[PDB]
């Protein structure tokens, strides 16, 4: 059920999706 996070260390553009989405939402604030 709960898997060990030292086991999770072995897994494969998420960083820039996170950064793009958060920045676009921050700009969209001006319009709301």
């Amino acid at each position: 059920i709960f898997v060990n996070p030292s086991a999770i260390r072995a897994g494969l553009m998420a960083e820039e999706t996170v950064d793009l989405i958060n920045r676009n939402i921050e700009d969209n604030q001006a319009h709301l």
């Binding site: 996070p5 897994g11 553009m13 820039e16 793009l20 958060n22």
Partner: protein, 365 residues
């Protein structure tokens, strides 16, 4: 879960509308309806599409998405460049109904104001009161140069009251998304139109937006943050969100307006589609006292009881190995300290039906 938005065949998003109107006449008919609160949704869409030609600007950088070229650096474009509008042989109705003081032809400035006010019915419809706060501010934007006053105060709200469901009319939603995508890319004289259309950005992507917002808030890298999602149901959800080829990282991609432009009717990034992840994030928000999370809606199907346990431990931090250790050591159960805290927050909150705050009160109180 079902339909990823990536266009596979180089075809622009497309809709079909009636026969192109004379724009002076269309303006007059539509303004008349705005004033009588008697708008025809097919006429509005035909007019909105034809008025695209008035919003020309220069593309500051090359613009491609899903293989489709929209513009090259320096091209003069309008919102019409982003999509294909097909049109039939069938003339719209174009009735004169309400007040029409204007004999002469409208200016471009007047068109843009009407376009702006019409699109703002999308935003007003999207809110399920505080509408009058929104509506009064919108009215003011569209009386303020470069826009021109063409309607009387309180007209917009009156008309909205008759158009409350327009946000799910697919052609109108399409046109809102197209205008929002245009003005997101092209700084323009009339950019303040986004006051009405901005809500199309990332529609049906609540699960993906919560996830990215959560990473920012805990102030970690995306790699480090994924380590904390160590329950076994999170694996397929996280995979689902980072399916390749979808352009989630591409500035100004059709991705950003995929739902409104009809690229998919079944978002894999919604709150339902990544329910375990969504549930966990918002149980963590609940533990921290965040009102946005306490008033969100629980995803009933995605083990909210278990997500609430993990959320207490994650909420207690704020190492991922250290958290996993505590949870196993406690047999996967919340401590009395976690429970005291969740109840302290939820029990002091104005709990909405099906909300995280209601769940917490029903479960732990």
């Amino acid at each position: 879960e079902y339909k990823y938005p990536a266009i596979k065949d180089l075809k622009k998003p497309c809709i079909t509308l009636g026969k192109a109107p004379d724009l002076n006449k269309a303006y007059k008919s539509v303004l008349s309806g705005m004033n009588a609160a008697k708008l025809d949704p097919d006429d509005v869409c035909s007019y909105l599409a034809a008025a695209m030609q008035f919003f020309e600007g220069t593309c500051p950088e090359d613009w491609t998405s899903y293989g489709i070229l929209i513009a090259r650096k320096g091209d003069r474009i309008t919102p019409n460049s982003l999509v294909e509008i097909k049109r039939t042989d069938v003339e719209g109705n174009w009735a004169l109904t309400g007040g029409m003081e204007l004999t002469r032809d409208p200016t471009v400035s007047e068109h843009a104001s009407l376009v702006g006010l019409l699109l703002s019915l999308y935003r007003l419809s999207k809110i399920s009161n505080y509408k009058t706060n929104i509506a009064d501010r919108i009215e003011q934007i569209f009386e303020t140069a470069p826009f021109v006053k063409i309607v009387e105060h309180h007209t917009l709200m009156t008309t909205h009251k008759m158009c409350a469901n327009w946000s799910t009319i697919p052609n109108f939603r399409f046109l809102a998304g197209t205008y929002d995508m245009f003005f997101s890319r092209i700084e323009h004289l009339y950019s303040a139109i986004r006051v009405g259309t901005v809500v199309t950005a990332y529609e049906d992507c609540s699960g993906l937006v919560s996830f990215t917002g959560f990473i920012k808030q805990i102030n970690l890298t995306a790699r480090e943050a994924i380590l904390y999602f160590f329950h076994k149901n999170f694996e397929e959800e996280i995979r689902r969100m980072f399916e390749p080829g979808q352009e989630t990282a591409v500035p100004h991609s059709y991705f950003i307006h995929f739902r409104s432009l009809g690229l998919s009717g079944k978002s894999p990034y919604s709150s339902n589609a990544v329910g375990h992840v969504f549930n966990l994030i918002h149980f963590v928000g609940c533990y921290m006292g965040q009102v946005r999370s306490l008033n969100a809606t629980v995803i009933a199907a995605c083990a909210p009881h278990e997500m609430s346990v993990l959320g207490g431990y994650l909420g207690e931090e704020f190492s991922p190995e250290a958290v996993y250790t505590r949870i196993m050591m406690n047999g996967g159960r919340l401590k009395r300290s976690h429970i005291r805290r969740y109840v302290s927050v939820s029990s002091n909150h104005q709990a909405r039906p099906n909300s995280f705050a209601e769940f917490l009160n029903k479960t732990y109180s």
